[PDB]
Design a protein around this ligand. Structure first.
Ligand SMILES: O=C(O)CCCC[C@@H]1SC[C@@H]2NC(=O)N[C@@H]21
Ligand SMILES: O=C(O)CCCC[C@@H]1SC[C@@H]2NC(=O)N[C@@H]21
Lengths: 115, 119, 119, 115
């Protein structure tokens, strides 16, 4: 356990984060399955650092919606010795007009643990 | 619709280049920041993300800084302004690498930037 | 130092008025927003907050919207620009009232605004 | 238990939030005691809504520091029937120059429970 993000993860909302083999340069791909909404299987792409307790970020391209979410976070080993992802996210909604842009960005935080 | 391809700058003078956009909305490119937290030499850094292929597309991307242990993500939407020029309204989160879990709370900065074409 | 007292506007046309500043940094005033989530009639709403009484003061405040169940908080810093005019750089969180705990995650919007004096 | 914010609260960082009697118009005052830093007793001022499951916000004026934090959130009764504050916050640090403003705002989330 050294925070190679590869594998399946869940958050408290019940969403599933599936991350593939991390490339030599830290790039990864995967799949996001969400139970909440403002059933979707959506692709993601991002990067992780190659260090101990890596930082990372990724974008989910929500299927059948005009929204996008980005997450960024860092992986740590908790007190019980297990890997936890601490994240914060921005959820962008599509606005009809430029003047409505101020309303288009939600923010939040979630922790992921392994399935 | 927008064409996120090409070169953009923000008010800080940072340069965003989107190299290619695929039919699934995925894109790749580079980011050259005019500002940093670190005292290390800034270098061009890679990015990956997605856009919607719609009118006034939303998009998001991650920059994997080549010169620090940080990561930044942006998400935003492209509009045409009054003059009919393309503008990307974005907000971003900058993650710094913390030493221990107990310091996690200090690790995330937030901000906004608007990108335009090079004048 | 800045004098946060008086009238300010942001790029959306919203009007921030700071009525008074006490020696402990506490201030009160009102906010009139040019934009809202609701379709209800916008009305002037009260605010309370604090500034540092330093050069280039940081500050924060909360607006208790009079016409909705939302709350917004801003925090920022005052600088002098190139022309020697006062500017407040802020970021804000807008909390909307959610029906149930399970919807909490949808409840917080974020953004940035800069405020200047009335021209 | 109907989310009158009055009383003592703690978050997972071990900070203490002390909120006084809420006024007729929803305004409140109080005191914030933090264990983390970038011992402080600091004043706060803010407002709560007068509704069920009230939203709220407040500013803490950190003693002996040039920083400010604002929180905004909503109070709910959890599954065990107890009051929880779900919050997000912006922490502003004082920058030396206008050009450094981009680096001055941290963001986060915390949940408070009663002491
Ligand atoms: O110093 C680091 O650790 C990485 C560089 C951070 C650059 C930040 S990220 C958000 C903001 N927008 C930019 O044009 N650059 C900065
Ligand atoms: O509609 C509501 O529920 C309350 C009005 C929200 C106004 C928002 S808060 C942040 C942003 N800055 C402004 O000048 N007004 C909007």
């Amino acid at each position: 356990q050294k925070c190679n993000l590869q594998g399946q993860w869940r958050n408290k909302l019940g969403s599933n984060l599936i991350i593939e083999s991390v490339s030599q340069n830290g790039e990864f791909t995967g799949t996001y399955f969400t139970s909440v909404s403002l059933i979707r299987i959506s692709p993601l792409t991002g990067y992780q650092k190659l260090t101990e307790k890596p930082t990372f970020g990724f974008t989910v391209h929500w299927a059948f919606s005009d929204s996008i979410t980005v997450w960024t976070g860092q992986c740590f080993l908790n007190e019980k010795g297990e890997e936890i992802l601490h994240t914060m996210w921005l959820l962008r909604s599509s606005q009809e007009k430029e003047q409505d842009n101020w309303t288009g960005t939600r923010v939040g935080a979630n922790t992921f643990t392994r399935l």
